[model samples]
Target chain A: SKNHQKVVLVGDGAVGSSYAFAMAQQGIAEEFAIVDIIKERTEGDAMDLEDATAFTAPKNIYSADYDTCKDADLVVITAGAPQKPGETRLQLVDKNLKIIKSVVEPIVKSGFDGIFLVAANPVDILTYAVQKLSGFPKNKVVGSGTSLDSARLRVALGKKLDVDPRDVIANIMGEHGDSEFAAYSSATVGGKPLLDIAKDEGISEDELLKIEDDVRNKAYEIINRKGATFYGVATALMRISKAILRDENSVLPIGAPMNGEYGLNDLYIGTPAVVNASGVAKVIEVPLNDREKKAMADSAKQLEEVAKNGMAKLQ
Target chain B: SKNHQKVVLVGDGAVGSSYAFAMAQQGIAEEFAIVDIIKERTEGDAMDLEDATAFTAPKNIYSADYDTCKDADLVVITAGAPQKPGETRLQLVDKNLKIIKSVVEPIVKSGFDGIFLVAANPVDILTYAVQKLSGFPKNKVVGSGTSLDSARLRVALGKKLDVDPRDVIANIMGEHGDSEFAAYSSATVGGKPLLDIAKDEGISEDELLKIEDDVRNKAYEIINRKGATFYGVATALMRISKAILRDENSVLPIGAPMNGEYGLNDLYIGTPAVVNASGVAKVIEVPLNDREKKAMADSAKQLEEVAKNGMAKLQ
Candidate 1:
């Protein structure tokens, strides 16, 4: 797998499809397989994505079943159910957890030894569920948390500072949702503190918080205009996959397992973590200021409560 | 521009946006600007694409007007009108020709001195339309022609031969459609002729022809199932742009200006050509067999006629 990377994607929705295309564009994973409940659509996407292989570096692409995951280096799970009409959040969780279970059991039964990357909704909880269900090492099951949010944050800051977003070193810590906080205390651009640059640029802390507020609601804003968000999130997943496949010890914001980081345990949450072929090598605990620390605590408490009840309800 | 690559994309449709996303995923251009007729949608796509910059390499992305092309290194035109009800093919050509004129005039007026990549419909004709309108060097105005078709061919042959498509040196030569033919006479896999491999595998020449036929109609097949094709085509566009941006002198299949290539001239037709920062460096005329040579000649004749009429119709 080191010499020849193989990847399997479960879920052929817009998010998964975009990620597959993004992966192809970057020419990662020498072999890629798609798995989806809608058999014909998965097959259709395979034909569509494979057409780009000649333009990109060469790779094999097709629609396959879980049995193919046996030799894969990574399997990305974007398979999840959308909320039903009037369905409770917890109810949606129950459904996706079942979906994850159904997916993981077969792959593990086929003796899939690769890392599992969960991009489904409630990703933090789902990632935890995968490790528990598959009985894999905690590091082997990662979730895409705060990754997209963190990107949205740096993008905003880059715009405000008139710089490239990639040069902005920042993180969106905690959950991937509303409660996530920008770890601005340690954020930097070219080794200069972002907050200091913001101050010098006449951007007040209030404005920065407002910027964070906008980052939190960016998904909703994009969906309002474009109907759904996929490109950003898909690109995020592709970045994480690159880190894993290349054995690059890149510090990326991801849903990493807790080992007393932020004084929490047994929960997967978003933080700047070292990612490599071994999955999460270690979590980098950002030295959050008082407000940001409290934000992380609140976000973790919220995630832990939902995860516990969600797992307790799972069969 | 050498240290920093600036790219502007006109036409924020699925094709243009996907190309922009592919560019982002690969982190090619340092700065990217989107331009389109629909103001709101272009801005929306800007916000959406910019979010991925944090995950990708830092890039400056935004929605802009044609005036933004002044300092750009590359401007890709994907802006074109769809066929009107009962509109003839000639009428559709006239319409896109006008659109390209509208696009090129403002760009050139803004003093843009960069490579032009045309991906609009009737691309060969429209690419000719651009160079004629802008009075730019013939090499500066490129087109996305058989690049996608070539990819489709390599992809199909890769599947049949059980090899990486990138390693299959093949070309879909001529116009992007209909008369285009696979130059399989000189095609090879890892320096072994593909025909020889097919012979060993018991794949008949008829089967190979059918594969070419399938590659030709893959767009229609995919559109039937997925509603439209963008990922593959957009990816094709991205690969060519990479060659141009990196000044790699990469030999790629694209709509290249003819200068006694296959005994043709005064047109941009599909062939393997050298691409670099200056645009089409030189056309690589395949050592086509008699049949493939006729295909190139006929395709050129068809393209020249349409381009002549299309440019004449423009105001």
Candidate 2:
């Protein structure tokens, strides 16, 4: 009935390619394009990935320029310089901000009108920047933010309690990185609060603390072995894309610009947002304990500082 | 409630690991395991893939042994030697049969009573062999056979006719390899016969012939560039597993044991089959053109020869 849904991916690196492969596997979108500055790499990835569709859902895939984003329902931006070893967070932000600007400008100039899913590091900042630069509505631009971190948190808690992670509803709120904090006040597993489960399972405060720490440092453990983290975040991008493209109306922790929710404003941060065909339909307000509320505020404050100081320096 | 729909992957190679990663992305299964003769590699993949779930559906993944398959609802076998660049079809079958036997025997011995999904090369033959070895019901054993081939056919035809592949319903029956044939007599695009579309689109018979050829040889084109084809078949495995684990009752072209269907008996080959929680519930017998019938017979004959000659030699 409707034309095949199209998704344009900006960046043909490991993360972008993985998302493309994941999308093909899920057979959610019928058309896919990978855009990258390295023309040869994009071409090679397109060719390599096109072969994968033969065994999964058939999707038209190719390497294209920014113009290809024009009719895309969603454009996932994973293009940015990698944060090198020993790079400071401020330096990473400045470097990625310039790349995001260059990428967003061309895409916007190409008449692209779709949800911008920012997957780059400093995603909250980049999401805010892209929204401002492209002049899209706040709801139309999202950062992958702490979605992966939330997943990591649920998985860690699941492992510690010997339960299914899908039954665990733990959210990592605020920034996408170290500053992110878990919304433990509202965490639950199988309709019961995680705290209750922990108590029932005789999980100690020390073990709970270790699980939280593990969730935070899980990326480093993976990166220490593999040199870069792609699969986790790539799948995160896929989940977000599915929510937007399929009109899933699924509630996920994503970076959305807040307009006085949680007593914060003028900042993009991770919160429970109901995502659908219209990108974010609404940001869900979960009641947080005083400690959790303060943690979220701290996380938002960190992102605001970067937006003001680092973003100003870049401009 | 249903024990989280566990799936045990018998091999942690490219195909198996890709399926694990895709499953995590789709959040289809709640439990997963990677088992291989190479213990260290399986461990590495488990750890590597576990990190990916942080951004995906929460699934417990680990490096495990046959004991892990004991409680799994489905055990996917991707453990076997890969086809060499210039290996003969017969040689490939013989090599993989040894690996499949070794894999299935221990799994069966572990008291695993779940469905056996054979994804190795010579998959049709492996499905039959695994059924005989595991003593599982005929319906519970399936090969990731012409499902991928059928997908390739849809993708190629969709490209030729400028339609989405999802709108194409084309089946590749018979073997998973060279002998596979497109059931063009029943192929349709957008509810219209593909033959009619070809006529309307001015697609030449010569072009249709080349499309089939392209679909058959697509794997080599990818392997030539990327060293192996994993993502496509990996997703196929995910699809098949989802059908069985979720009891989707979806129809797919899988390697199913035939009983007096297509004028063939006592052989496993690629045919249109209904897949669900109980495994293949029915094998749909579509009317074939005289030419297509001859091709299907030839494909079955080849598989029968392998079962009688090559399999006896293995015993």
Candidate 3:
């Protein structure tokens, strides 16, 4: 309830930087601060942000240590090993999970009481790990999960439907990795189902499957071509930041701790949630068909295997 | 080249928006695109562009209109008025100004070969004045300036200043009415001049002056509590749209077209110049003592009175 909102971003890597750029451009945080293990990089980014602040809406942006989180309202954690060439985000879990443990410990010990917006790789698993470690209640710890991938899916469908991507409300469910499934049943355009739109437009099922293929492989295509994908992720981060900073109760599909809703337990999975000033406020369980349900369960099982192995290393 | 650039603002009213906000947020745009008739109301305002864009850059802002000049690389005219307590922006400017003739004809006849970015003032302005009048360029006419105002200035400034002013950096230079002004000299913190920050910090008295009083009086002191000030002008119409659309090469100081540099010609009034792809690419020669020196002569020679009396009313 401080007059000015304090926003801190931990890690100054590519993901962190993208999130930082989004946050800085949006002017979401009043007393904006950056934190990182490499003090010099964080300070450098802080100075760079300061220079940009003059170009921004008169913000006071600087770099600080985790101790500065003592009163921060939102702490965005994008600290994790990036997907190297020929490597998937899930494969980097062990390296990132270790880093997350080190990073989250100090943040929690700093007497911080705020939402943890995480965008780490193996996001569903990492998010669950952070929630368990922080013990800050489930709603307070959320992950970006498959939001970007879903946005990509929507973008792909937009191209096929010849409509604005924003107007197409499609869902990419389950994990944020290769095993992720597209919720074709819930796909909507202008309040109409995608299937109905195709039927009305005289489009065939083959064309729809092609679009889904593009959606699933879009990230890989970008990674293959440009080494990584940042634009979509950056935009997603901006949207998420907006939800928290503006207290806008935007219903976005992001990573959330699965209770008994999806028949998943003690695992972080992608779900539609209400995001606002308090971060993930409520998890929205979208009813899935049999095939989609099986896919979701399969994704959860895959994530649990990786997380179980990752956590075993912790012991 | 007239050391100063000419900008034109299309409409003046509450919510009329401005080209000045665009310029102010970026702190550039030698030429402005303000279109209004009111003079004093257009000046003196320290728009605290609250942090609304939540993560966008800032710029200079002003208010003005077309017929201000023909030699502008950017003729960004945000037509129509703003929504009032009881009336709509369309109701005010809709029936008046032959909104089609008073604005559009002069711009086309001026041989303007630049971009025109407008906002949804009346919706009619989008297809009316801009598209029909200026046919010299392609993709040069757009109507999406306010999104940046709400995105960049209003919310952004609020974050920085710890206040509730939406980060909207707008300036309706020319005729955006009393609601507009090219707040070139008004943007500062703790009354410290932006350009002369070192001096404002009391480090150097070399640049200190009584000019601050004149600059501060441009927005509020003149308009008072009579009507709404166009903060959205600087944040939207001016800063965001023109910056992208016109690919202009100008800065901002609000007023009708004046003759000469700061001390030369006898027509038009306002400050600074510069605009381009980055919006307001450079600043004009604002000779320190000379700007004040010309003010004395400018006061005696009423640029608006002489121009208004001499020029026949557009049919």
Candidate 4:
């Protein structure tokens, strides 16, 4: 079948729809199926998506249930609820954890043997929940961690350095929603260290820190103004999905399953990792300084505690 | 600063918003501005669209006035009124004709000396109107024409032949709103004549005609189910916009101003043409069969008459 690739998107919400649109525009998948609790929305979304095939590339797109994912190459989960007003953080996790269970169990029972890429928020925890619930190998389940954050970081760095963001090799590390910090020590631009580039440009350390803070809260700014943030994260999903489906082994910022990277274990956290058909092929463990290392370790600790507590509550 | 491209999109409706999103997704255009009478919608859309740049290539996306078109390399107009229930077709044209007058006049006065790509309803007529109104060179104003229709034709054939649609080199020719015919005689797949391929596959001319008919009415089928069509046309716009921005002399299905091609003159009709920075660089008039030739000429004649009547009524 010439490496035919199929993607099952388990959500017809804003992010999922945009990700589906992104995939269509890039002509990535040969077949795309949408699964959502609202079957009508999925059907409508699929109909609209298939119409896009006319101008992009030929792909069969339709709304379907979990069974349709039986032979899919990848299953992307963007199905989860956001924090309701006056709700506690754990309350949010408990709610979304149950949703994740219901979603994953059907997919597992469907005999789907595909990589699970979760973009559900608190994405790091939900991604961990997916791997454990489905009993897939660690590498087989990834998340939209600081991928968006790194993009924001790269974007900020590009402006500060007056260059194309794509040429700025920088990443946000630690958490999808940060305890995230710029992996500033490992950042580079045009083959030179980012620190050196920044210094040469007469940009101060305070400004880089300010950029990190701004990148961390950029979503808040957008959501504050435009209601919700989707396109950036959707695009991140598309980028990572391409790496997996194309088996390109591209190094990207994602929720990589950690095993002794940054002296951490038993969790998925934000880091740059080599990704391909096998999912997280390898972690490109960045060399962090004393302060950044503490931040990374501290970030993983909170995620670890949250992941364990969230799953324990589910049981 | 290296031939920086700015695209000012007039109309923040579904088609234009999707086109803007498509542009963001494809990382095209250095600066994008949205202009619509409903200024708030455009502002909101621009805010939402700008969020996408964090992940895609960096770009400045914002709501602006027609004056923003002053330095724009391309001004894309998807602004026009659709026929309402019980409304006559001419009435709809007159309504949209006034709308186009309001839109183009401001851009012209803004000193916008650039290409205009129109994708509004009755695109060919409006495109002719734009050229005459702006007094731009005929080549500088183009219509989306049969671009999406050709994409639809390619998709239908790809499935029938069990091939990727992109490999099936085919086009739907004539008026965008069809007096259209499939340019089957000139079609090919993998550099092999499409007619021979169809014959090899035991397909008949009736089937080909059915494909053409289905493509012409596909929007109806899609609109019957989903609300309306946008993604395919948006993708087509993005593709053509790229050809122009990148200065690629790519052949595309567009409503090109005719100069003796198919014995037509002073009218825009759907046909294969070379598109580059200067807009319709050249028209690659398809060698059509007798039936197809009449359909194309008939298509042009109807469009020419409609365009003249529509514009004269404006005066």
Candidate 5:
């Protein structure tokens, strides 16, 4: 009655579980349904969440099938091949694209007239593909793009700068996986340029880039260390979900379809956009310099090739 | 690094700004202190929560004193009174307690070894009382127990029946102002016992209680409404706070010294306790029959006069 949104998760794999956990911890959706080809696994995950509900907010958590997506306010697709040891997120592109099509077609056929948020690897491409294939508005089909990577960079920088990540306004742009770049030139702390501010704080440009590079490769690093990266991405999902559910209209780096923004077209890319109740409320075309713009293009191009290959394989 | 198991509430105003909010949001602490004499307005009268820490998790949150106890893990006290109709939580507790001693004494002199959680009837109590009374638990102190009230009775029963508040569990608890309570016994769903459980369902009878009278009569009904109760207490200070902070063996009724057990000796009057890192980890002695042993003698007898006076004053 109060418009507390309902979220239907189309998978219950690693990424799906983490996003569900984030949603559970954040109390974003009043009701959530975890659907997977393996019904038992989906129900198990839902049951596990039910136990924690006593320790969390009141959410109607359960497992369901595609029919449950009919009236859902949002559908998140996180089921697909997880990154293997040392395998890059881009490696999962061709495999996940097939999974994405299988999931999207049924949801659209079910008359699911809601926003679709994808968290599978090669998300930018999948998000764009979903929008095109499902015939949903570009704004409605978004990706958990560089939001996680960007926050990782922000937190990493905060640690290096000894400032609360809350005070760091930095974001990684381009892909959800690697091939992303830190908008170092535009990063700011307390509204002041980070380099200029760090100058007084005794941090050099090279040291900052090294830290940025490390953050950029954090997923692979974690994968090398522990097999997969989910917490940070799940956390990003929580934040994004809140922005959409609460209509926060906050700017975040996500993979949204480009409408000639950032000198790009017909591709999904990680860039800043206003997220609110109506999904991608508005696209944010941040002012980037020559080097940053060129890097953004390079990253987008990398995503396009992966997407083209993925679609070709699917066909 | 040392474990900073402390929660310091900095404000005390309406149900929204009281120490209860600290309890739910922070979810930490062992002991609680109300830095106010308007005890009825303390943050102790709230509800059991589901999603209080929707944003972040803190160590502990409760009301404690500067004089008698200083080794407390947390200190929460709603000192001031409510405000003008439209005043925000920031506006309400910012004034009243500014002129009281519950705001001054132990906070400064008792060498308070922990945080200061503040919830006052009047707005000014936040700045004034806490400043004069608190001995720099540092930024450990915080305020906003009313957030607990917001999460009250609705979720409590919602959990009991495995149904949403709109379905069968129609409920709310605590005093938004002076007193509040749910018609617990009359709180029937389809005219069945509120504790009706299905075997296939994961409901636990051990978790239910016959404290309908207590839950209802609370705050005086919370004072007139139960004349000022503590749904905020059950939710934040008791349940939510313990989940975040200290490993204290406390219960969720109200805060005060307990000289005797149920039939134990002197000091303040509260209820059965079992609070820990998870806030009220286990409900202590849920009286099954009349003579499991009535230990309320020492405590009840000792508080006879005070109880009579409190009731008389209400009358």
Candidate 6:
């Protein structure tokens, strides 16, 4: 069971398919399967994607039913109601919760003992829902969460200061959406405090605030131009997948089940966590400034309301 | 310049932009730039890609001109005439050759000293043209040749035999087109000769031949449906770039200049070449059967004729 490596994607939409393609392109798994409510779409996409593998590392890809998840190393749940035009992610919570329940119930019944990587919108809430619905351990459940938001933070800071994002160490804590807030207190560029870099570069607080706003609204800017965003989130999903599949205890900003981390409990939200084969290996309790702590509380309050509302409907 | 890691992409079309996006997704480079004849497209894609990077490692991406190549570690040349409907790859040679010249001339004039990764169609010939035009050493010029084709071979064989493609060690040598042939002589499945596995599985010779045919024609089939092929080729481009950037002497099937290897000279074609920091570190001459040798020679002949005619037109 520990030796076989396979990934099952339970959504063949843009996000799910893109993750599959990204994984294939990276040769991140031995076998990949796509599951969709529409069998024809999954089958067609799988066949079409097989052509792409001809130029990638050797891997098996196909469309499969819930039976495929029985031995999967990871099951990525991206199947949920999509964000409608002019709708906030939290607003779709009730609809997506039902979708997650319907999808997760079958995979759980089929005896999938793999990590659940939730990428559906309102991810923090849905990730919690999947954990409760499937009755899986907390570590086995993760939301793509503010991993993307943290990336956005690093990128925004890197651009403002003219440095590589890889050298920027930052995290976006709390929700995966607008409720998310950057942990600027722990932010660093190449091991130097970001604030120090800002001071050294004569950057104004106004500029920093503008950069934060830009990072927060980045998805909206792209969604307005393109129909929806995928490349960024899909990339984050792959990073998380790699950490788990490769058994890399890589520190990534992922939404882990909160248990007294940052003084929160029974909630799933973004925080810096070490991800490995056993899923979330550790949730890092990075020291936060008072402002960030307050922001985290606010984000958690918003998520709690949404999670409670969605769970009530699911029951 | 050696302290910095940057990649410049010429031709912001599907393949070029996808490479940019892939690199951004993987955080493969510290800096990424895109160039195209259509400045608006490059700027637009660069901006859109920058948004994607908000969720990725720290990296800078921008739309730039030839000046950007001066300090780049690799300048990917995907700029050229696209293959038209019903047009063979060889037919695009004349047009792509000129495009390579115009593109390479400016970069060379800008004092570029980086590896020139050619992904344009008829890549072997275009790689040779860029080398000759830019007067870069043969080792510094690489064609995204049978790497993708070889990947296709492994995927096809893996599917037929029900094994992971990564375990399929097969190579497609000679041209990047129809003239290419799979070197089944060196093929293996998990360190076992593929022939032995085929025999073990009671696979028919006819089945092997069908698999070869499918691998060779995979691009055409995908093109017929998708209009153009990018994902597969783009993935191959990333593999090669990573090998060079990471100084990984990874053995890859790339278009290497012929220097009496396989009894050919004065050409660049697909061969198993070792890629490292200095580019093609070595050309691995895998022993081939008589049939494969003859097929390679035929492919060389086809490529030689196309290169000669294209060179004559350029002069």
TM-score of each: 0.92, 0.82, 0.59, 0.87, 0.60, 0.82
Best by lDDT: 1
TM-score of chain B of each: 0.97, 0.96, 0.39, 0.98, 0.34, 0.96
Give the TM-score (vs. native) of candidate 4.
0.87
Interface RMSD of every predicted model, in angstroms:
1.4, 3.4, 17.1, 3.1, 15.7, 3.8
In TM-score terms, which candidate is top? Answer: 1
Q: Candidate 5 residues A158-236, lDDT tens each?
A: 5567665656778788876557788877888878988787688898877876876776676665555334555466667
TM-score of chain B for predicted candidate 4 = 0.98
DockQ of 4: 0.36
TM-score of chain A of each: 0.98, 0.96, 0.92, 0.98, 0.93, 0.96
lDDT of 3 by residue, A1-315 (tens): 357888888876655655564455456677777887767566555533432342345556677999988899888887877756677655577778888899889999899998888887767878877887788888888788988877777655654666656667778888887788888787788789888998988878777766666667876665553344554565577688778878888988899777887888778788778998888888888879788899899989988888888878764
- Judge candidate 4 against the unseen true structure and give its global Cα lDDT, from 0 to 1: 0.86
Q: Give the alpha carbon lDDT tens digit for every residue of B198-254 in model 6.
A: 888888777877777887887767656445566667778888998999999999999
Alpha-carbon error at B268 in model 1, in Å? 1.9
Q: Which DockQ value does candidate 5 get?
A: 0.03
Candidate order by lDDT, highest to lowest? 1, 4, 6, 2, 3, 5
Off by over 4 Å in 4: A37-62, A81-91, A190-209, A224-227, A285-298, B24-31, B36-64, B81-88, B185-209, B224-226, B287-294
* DockQ, 0 to 1 scale, candidate 3: 0.03
Name every residue pair that clashes in candidate 1: A166-B58
Local accuracy of candidate 2 as per-residue lDDT tens digits, A1-315: 126788999987767877888787677787898888877667656655664565466677888999888788889999888878799878888888889889998888889887889998778888988887898998899889888888778767767777666667899888877777788879887778877877888987677767777777877776664455666677778888888887889989999779888998888888989998888888887889887788888888778987888768867
Candidate 3 docking band: incorrect
CAPRI classification of candidate 6? acceptable
Q: Highest DockQ among the candidates is held by which one?
A: 1
Over A28-113, each residue of candidate 4 has an lDDT whose tens digit, in order, gives: 98889999986766776675676567657678888999998789989999998888889988899999999999999999999999
Record all residue pairs in model 4 with backbone atoms less than 3 Å apart, i.e. clashing: none
Q: For residue B134, what is the lDDT in candidate 5?
A: 50
True contacts kept of each: 0.81, 0.37, 0.00, 0.43, 0.00, 0.29
Ranking by TM-score: 1, 4, 2, 6, 5, 3
